[PDB]
Amino acid sequence: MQRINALTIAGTDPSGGAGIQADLKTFSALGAYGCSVITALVAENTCGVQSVYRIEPDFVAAQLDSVFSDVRIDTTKIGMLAETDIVEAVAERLQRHHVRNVVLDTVMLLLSPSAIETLRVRLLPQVSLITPNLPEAAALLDAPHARTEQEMLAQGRALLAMGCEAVLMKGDWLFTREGEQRFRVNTKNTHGTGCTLSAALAALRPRHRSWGETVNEAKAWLSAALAQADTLEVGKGIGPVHHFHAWW
Amino acid sequence: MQRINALTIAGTDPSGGAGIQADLKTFSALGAYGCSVITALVAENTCGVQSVYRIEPDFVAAQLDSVFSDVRIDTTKIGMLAETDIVEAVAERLQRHHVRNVVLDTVMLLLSPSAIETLRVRLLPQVSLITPNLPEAAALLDAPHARTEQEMLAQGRALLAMGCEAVLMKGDWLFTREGEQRFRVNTKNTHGTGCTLSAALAALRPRHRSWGETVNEAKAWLSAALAQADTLEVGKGIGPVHHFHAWW
């Protein structure tokens, strides 16, 4: 297989189940060399977040430069952005280096109205695939939570018009200019699922013909990771999936 | 195989070849769930270091607490410590949680005389295995660079007396209370070799009877990683080894 370098721009999880830790494990497990720009540090746990430590947007930019000025990046996954200046810094470097295959996860359960505003205007026109759930989609569109399937489909299409090449609305429906495509969990250890799925979609995209195929393989792989989550021995709270279920 | 959780306490490398990025990949490639406490951030490259961003020792401690208060750690690798307060914070948590199988790499090419002083007094008595090269060993002992084999053996033994359970002097000689044991590179892409070897020794220790056996398997694995370093496509400078040579 051809060599693919994948980059993750996100926050950290010391317990190793989410954040760039999860992104990097996923890249690794799916045959991609991993790079990582840290946007924020967090003392995180399997029992929750203890505290967040912010990083100067300027150093995030410096990190972005160290990577893009030296390593060819074939796919990129974006997680926690934290604030307006970070969003701007990321969007700016993405544009400058013509970064393709950008998968944007929607970590905003939080971001200021200013940060969100910047995200939709500066970042969205640069993402290949965005992966929000219902609450996040409404927030990105500043619209009411989708009540029915039609409203949900309308939001998916609205996000495309905003610049996204594709949208994966998590209930799952995949949106593309072409049309829509429709897509269980038996474990409580689901910590980092969101980070992992978006990382998987990023790592696998270059190995497929379309988003439909990569979305299909990504979900199959994730289900397998969740199906092995209980065999791990980490934490007293909600454990992480098992990224290396296929290896050990 | 029994589940083993490995922790790395070190700095970062956005280009993914060294730091916790390398430690985490190595843990993953060797069958261990990885955790990571970040001691310092650095805009690093395959062409060198662009800049260093320091983290408050208090947040390093907070990170240590998020991990030790929730995840059972079976092995630990220590890299960049940066300053006195970080060294102290790490030593203190190591002692409090009776952390075993501590592999201490010697990242000091730099540390203030105060930091080094704190390291030998507070940290050394807690490490299972230290892995310095000649220049680093002399610095830790505040002694002249070893001129001959005898002087080198003397330094190894001196470091044991200082509290280290074992010493791996990289020229390689392994030192233990029992005695000594003696242990090529055909690639230019050696970025992160030091981080990788110490991470490998940490991840493999629990799967072996003694340090001699784990040192033997760790080196075999590393040589294989270096022998595949050229098949990767990252950077314009000195590339990293291929941590996943055995998988893809």
Angle at B84 between CA A52 and CA B100, to 5 degrees: 80
The verdict on whether A190 is a catalytic residue reads: yes
What letter represents residue A118's amino acid?
T
Angle, helices A19-29 vs A193-204, to 10°: value is 40
Helix, strand or coil for residue A38?
strand
Which of B31, B35, B233 shows the shortest C-beta gap to A72? B233
User: Angle, nearest 10°, between helix axes B134-141 and B149-161?
Assistant: 50
Catalytic-residue membership of A235:
no
- Catalytic: which of A11, A12, A19, A195? A195
Number of structural domains (chain B) is 1
* Chain A contact present for B45, CB below 8 A: yes
- Distances in Å between the Cα of A189 and the Cα atoms of A133, A219, B233 are 19, 17, 35
The C-alpha atoms of residue A163 and residue A156 are separated, in whole angstroms, by 12
Q: Which residues of A touch B3 (CB under 8 A)?
A: 231-233
Judged by a CB distance cut-off of 8 A, whether residue B48 touches chain A is: no
Neighboring chain A residues of B36 at a CB cutoff of 8 Å: 12, 14, 16, 21
Q: Which two tokens stand for residue B44?
A: 């690093």
CATH of the domain at A173: 3.40.1190.20
Nearest-Cα distance to chain B for A128, in Å, is: 23
* Residues in A 199-238 with any Cβ partner in B closer than 8 A: 231-237
Residues pairing with B103 in the sheet: B77, B129
Q: Do B233 and A14 touch (CB under 8 A)?
A: no
Rounded CA separation A197/A49 (Å): 21
Residue whose C-alpha is closest to residue A88's, from A67, A70, A64, A71: A64
- The three-class DSSP label of residue B219 is helix
Report yes or no: A59 at the B interface, CB cutoff 8 Å: yes
Residue A178: is it exposed, middle or buried by C-beta count within 10 angstroms (0-12/13-18/19+)?
exposed
β A33-45/A5-11 pair status? parallel
Compute the distance between CA of residue B108 and CA of residue B146 in angstroms, rounded to an integer. 17
Angle, vertex CA B242, rays to CA B20 and CA B108, nearest 5 = 40
Domain span including residue B212:
1-248
**Alpha carbon distance B109, B131 (integer Å):** 14
- Resolution, expressed in angstroms to one decimal: 2.3
Tell me the CA distances in angstroms from B150 to B129, B145, B173, B229, one per residue in order: 21, 12, 12, 35
Residues of A in contact with B45 (CB under 8 A): 66-67, 69-70
Q: Report the distance separating Cα A70 and Cα B88, nearest Å.
A: 35
Residue B36 in tokens: 């990571």
Decide if A6 touches B, using CB distance below 8 A: no
Write out the two tokens for A35.
Answer: 């790079």
The values of phi and psi at residue A148, to 5°, are -125, 175
Per DSSP, chain B holds a count of helices (H) and strands (E) of 8, 9
Which H/E stretch holds residue A37? strand A33-45
A16 touches chain B (CB under 8 A): yes
Residue among B17, B16, B15, B57 nearest B38 (CA): B57
Kindly compute the dihedral angle of the four CA atoms of residues B44, A67, B63, A40, in this order, to the nearest 10 degrees.
130
Residue A154 CB coordination number (10 Å): 14
Method: X-ray
Q: Show contacts of B166-170: CB within 8 Å, 24+ apart.
A: B166/B128, B166/B129, B166/B130, B166/B211, B167/B129, B167/B130, B167/B131, B167/B132, B168/B129, B168/B130, B168/B131, B168/B201, B168/B211, B168/B215, B169/B132, B169/B133, B169/B134, B169/B137, B170/B131, B170/B132, B170/B133, B170/B134
Nearest to B46 among A14, A71, A247 (CB): A71
Closest to A212 measured CA to CA, from A234, A241, A182, A232: A182
